[PDB]
Design a protein around this ligand. Structure first.
Ligand SMILES: NC(=O)c1ccc[n+]([C@@H]2O[C@H](COP(=O)([O-])OP(=O)(O)OC[C@H]3O[C@@H](n4cnc5c(N)ncnc54)[C@H](OP(=O)(O)O)[C@@H]3O)[C@@H](O)[C@H]2O)c1
Ligand SMILES: O=C(O)c1ccccc1Nc1cccc(C(F)(F)F)c1
Ligand SMILES: O=C(O)c1ccccc1Nc1cccc(C(F)(F)F)c1
Length: 315
């Protein structure tokens, strides 16, 4: 139930998504992360951006203290936020995340996004029009700082998120590169299946990790309400009926069968327990072809605040 990363460490192929929007009480992350571990999730995905690392960390530490898991059984991810791309800010950002979570190391630390933002106090600094104040940082220098964090033992593995093929290539061609990214965590689902990026990642031994695999949380801040609702897709519905599973389970299994590590966020006890059933059934070649046919270049995260950035990954 794991994949071997290009640095020798192992990553569980099903991960628990911990982001919930600010209107959800912070205490919920503690409750649901414990439930996720109880259900069998061993890969837990968080970030500085999520304002939940204390709660998620506490959940992990609670399950270690009561004997349910060892630290070595848990794969915990955090991410460097975009206001901290300047190399001198990388290690301090990681140390802050470790202090919040009360952990000695993260299993994985990612550059959250290639879209560098102005260093400062704000998560999303703005001008007048609500467009973000961008920063211009050579992400190869950021990567060097990430490498130093691995060497120091603060992160077992390092990788990237929201990078396109070209951006990934720039890191891979860096003179004196010490560690390749182990993964690229990107938006990935049947409406945006990333086939060409997946092929590229496979060719370089980089794991593609899918987020919004269930169609995203459809947050009004970044997602058009008109966009088709992935879990109401008729083809996924037909496949769910055929296998007597659910559309969510079909969407998750699709990713595993393509060699994509898949995340799944749920703050509902029943759905958390449901999602671990992804290992209990298989899709046929014809099922996979049907799902492949759904691709319509649809990234749910689709806002002016992303699209105007000079390092916006989508074309
Ligand atoms: N690197 C990045 O920039 C980035 C971006 C986005 C997400 N992520 C990571 O990926 C995780 C997941 O992506 P996401 O947050 O977009 O959500 P998602 O996994 O696509 O899930 C979307 C929604 O599906 C619902 N759901 C879950 N299981 C279900 C089931 N069995 N049946 C029906 N509905 C189900 C959840 O609602 P309920 O809670 O009500 O069950 C959830 O809000 C995040 O939490 C985060 O850790 C990373
Ligand atoms: O094992 C990998 O390398 C793997 C990588 C990405 C996605 C899925 C992967 N493996 C996988 C896919 C389905 C079922 C099982 C297992 F049988 F181990 F549970 C493992
Ligand atoms: O990581 C999350 O779950 C996330 C949550 C809320 C808002 C944005 C998020 N991720 C994110 C953050 C910065 C840039 C991009 C993207 F590249 F997709 F645009 C995605």
């Amino acid at each position: 139930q794991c994949v071997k990363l290009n640095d020798g460490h192992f990553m569980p192929v099903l991960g628990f998504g911990t982001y919930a929007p600010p209107e959800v009480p912070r205490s919920k992350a503690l409750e649901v992360t414990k439930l996720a571990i109880e259900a069998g999730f061993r890969h837990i995905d968080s970030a500085h951006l999520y304002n939940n690392e204390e709660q998620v960390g506490l959940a992990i530490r609670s399950k270690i203290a009561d004997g349910s898991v060892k630290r070595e059984d848990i794969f915990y991810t955090s991410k460097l936020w975009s206001t901290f791309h300047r190399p001198e800010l990388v290690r301090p950002a990681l140390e802050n995340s470790l202090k919040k979570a009360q952990l000695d190391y993260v299993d994985l630390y990612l550059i959250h996004s290639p879209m560098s933002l102005k260093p400062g106090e704000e998560l999303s600094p703005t001008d007048e029009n609500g467009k973000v104040i961008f920063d211009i940082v050579d992400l190869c220098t950021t990567w060097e700082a990430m490498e130093k964090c691995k060497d120091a033992g603060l992160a077992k593995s390092i990788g990237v998120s929201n990078f396109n093929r070209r951006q990934l290539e720039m890191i891979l061609n860096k003179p004196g590169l010490k560690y390749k990214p182990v993964c690229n965590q990107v938006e990935c689902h049947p409406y945006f299946n990333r086939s060409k990026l997946l092929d590229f990642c496979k060719s370089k031994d980089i794991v593609l990790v899918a987020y919004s695999a269930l169609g995203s949380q459809r947050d009004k801040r970044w997602v058009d309400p008109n966009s088709p609702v992935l879990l109401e897709d008729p083809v996924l519905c037909a496949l769910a009926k055929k296998h007597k599973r659910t559309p969510a389970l079909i969407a998750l299994r699709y990713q595993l069968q393509r060699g994509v590590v898949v995340l799944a966020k749920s703050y509902n006890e029943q759905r958390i327990r449901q999602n671990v059933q992804v290992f209990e059934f298989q899709l046929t070649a014809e099922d996979m072809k049907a799902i492949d046919g759904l691709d319509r270049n649809l990234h749910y995260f689709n806002s002016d605040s992303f699209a105007s950035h000079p390092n916006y990954p989508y074309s």
